[PDB]
Amino acid sequence: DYCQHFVDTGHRPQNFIRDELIRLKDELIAKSNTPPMYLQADIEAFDIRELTPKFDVILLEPPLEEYYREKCWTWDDIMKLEIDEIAAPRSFIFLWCGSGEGLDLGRVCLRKWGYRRCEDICWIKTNKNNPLDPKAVFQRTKEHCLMGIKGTVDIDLIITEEPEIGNIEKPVEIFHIIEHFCLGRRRLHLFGRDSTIRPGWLTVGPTLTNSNYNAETYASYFSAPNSYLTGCTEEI
Amino acid sequence: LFPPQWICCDIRYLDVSILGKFAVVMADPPWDITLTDDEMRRLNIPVLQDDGFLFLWVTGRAMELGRECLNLWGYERVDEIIWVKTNQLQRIIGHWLNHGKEHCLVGVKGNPQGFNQGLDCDVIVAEVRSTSHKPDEIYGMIERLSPGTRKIELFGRPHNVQPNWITLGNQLDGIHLLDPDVVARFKQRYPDGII
Numbered sequence: 420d421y422c423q424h425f426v427d428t429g430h431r432p433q434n435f436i437r438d439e440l441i442r443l444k445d446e447l448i449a450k451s452n453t454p455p456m457y458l459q460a461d462i463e464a465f466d467i468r469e470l471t472p473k474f475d476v477i478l479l480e481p482p483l484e485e486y487y488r489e490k491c492w493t494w495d496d497i498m499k500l501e502i503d504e505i506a507a508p509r510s511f512i513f514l515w516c517g518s519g520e521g522l523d524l525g526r527v528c529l530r531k532w533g534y535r536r537c538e539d540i541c542w543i544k545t546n547k548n549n550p551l552d553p554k555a556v557f558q559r560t561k562e563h564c565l566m567g568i569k570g571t572v573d574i575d576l577i578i579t580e581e582p583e584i585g586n587i588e589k590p591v592e593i594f595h596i597i598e599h600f601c602l603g604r605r606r607l608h609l610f611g612r613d614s615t616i617r618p619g620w621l622t623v624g625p626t627l628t629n630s631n632y633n634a635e636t637y638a639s640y641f642s643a644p645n646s647y648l649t650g651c652t653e654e655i
Numbered sequence: 656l657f658p659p660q661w662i663c664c665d666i667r668y669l670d671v672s673i674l675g676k677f678a679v680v681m682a683d684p685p686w687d688i689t690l691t692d693d694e695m696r697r698l699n700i701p702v703l704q705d706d707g708f709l710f711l712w713v714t715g716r717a718m719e720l721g722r723e724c725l726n727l728w729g730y731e732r733v734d735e736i737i738w739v740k741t742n743q744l745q746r747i748i749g750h751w752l753n754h755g756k757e758h759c760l761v762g763v764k765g766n767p768q769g770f771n772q773g774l775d776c777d778v779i780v781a782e783v784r785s786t787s788h789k790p791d792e793i794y795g796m797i798e799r800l801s802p803g804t805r806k807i808e809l810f811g812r813p814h815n816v817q818p819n820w821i822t823l824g825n826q827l828d829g830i831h832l833l834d835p836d837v838v839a840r841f842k843q844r845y846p847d848g849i850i
């Protein structure tokens with residue numbers, strides 16, 4: 420009984436979870452990856468349509484007020500993003516929802532932008548190194564990143580130690596999970612940061628200090644014969 | 656009252672009005688991922704409680720449908736428990752990702768008072784017993800949250816019987832009841848014992 424133990428000792432049940440080749444896939448991804456691109460932009464006051472082409476993947480990480488417990492975006496603000504305006508007809512979304520009303524309002528968003536939810540990925544936060552919301556019945560120890568599909572390996576669990584207070588960063592494992600899906604190479608990360616910039620991704624955010632985005636230069640990476648690469652194969 | 660009680664029945668056709676009010680409801684429905692979605696929606700969940708909590712196991716598209724029933728029945732989802740499935744070595748045992756877990760939505764209704772909010776955390780780590788069995792840790796968590804109160808499980812199996820719980824499910828062994836008030840209304844509503 421790891422729930423009785425947590426009651427007794429303060430160690431969250433997850434602390435006691437233990438633990439081919441592949442690896443080739445990871446170098447195929449890394450060789451296919453476009454140069455990192457990044458653009459600072461106040462997404463609220465930003466016509467999201469300036470980001471072309473349509474994206475095969477969108478990773479959406481709005482700064483919810485709940486992440487600052489000790490500008491925040493409300494699900495009011497998020498729902499009004501025109502994400503369907505920049506999503507390819509067949510495309511995926513990965514939306515970080517936290518652990519409160521975002522688990523409900525995030526599903527509204529996905530449906531409003533045209534997706535259906537095919538996976539629920541949980542970030543489970545251990546507290547091995549340091550053994551509440553008014554509506555909360557339980558202590559909240561995880562975050563949900565919902566995966567959506569619009570159009571026609573790994574587990575759904577990320578286990579890391581809980582980050583120190585005021586650190587809003589999400590586990591870098593979400594990128595490996597996403598990139599192992601081999602969904603294409605047009606990858607957009609909204610509300611990314613200098614710290615999250617990554618080969619094979621376009622990163623847009625208000626706190627970026629530098630930008631290098633050029634629509635025509637960006638679009639040049641996916642022109643023929645490279646238009647339909649999964650991102651998991653050899654250079655055309 | 657306090658010892659295990661149960662009722663073999665079809666929850667679609669049982670007049671649950673005879674059972675009274677409970678501090679906690681748990682359900683592990685046979686989602687069509689069987690009861691059709693309309694049958695799930697028309698279950699008379701609302702009569703079971705006035706103030707308290709609902710625990711509702713969801714998977715696949717029931718993650719969205721269950722939220723619908725939850726709001727339909729008159730609840731607000733305030734939490735979501737995940738059960739991480741392990742083996743005996745505590746290693747981890749949906750066409751896109753392998754599934755390490757089961758979800759259980761927590762609903763609140765009314766304004767319950769005197770409950771022990773915050774005693775456990777929303778993650779269960781426990782070994783998979785028989786297939787389709789749920790971990791007994793959930794009963795421990797539910798008891799610490801509302802000690803000594805009336806509880807009812809819908810679509811439970813024989814092993815699910817627990818003190819303080821009435822268990823409704825169609826693969827139970829007949830009708831076993833002990834709370835006098837329930838005994839009463841059951842004989843009044845079902846004088847001949849069929850349903």
Ligand SMILES: CNc1cc(N2CCC[C@@](O)(CNC(=O)c3ccc(CN4CCCCC4)cc3)C2)ncn1
Pocket residue numbers: 664665666667683684685689690712713757787788789790810811812823824825826
């Ligand atoms: C027709 N109308 C009914 C039906 C009815 N049952 C139908 C037959 C089975 C039943 O007997 C007992 N339920 C289960 O075996 C059952 C177990 C587990 C899951 C999934 N689960 C996995 C474990 C953690 C959460 C997810 C789903 C179902 C109830 N009972 C009354 N009326």
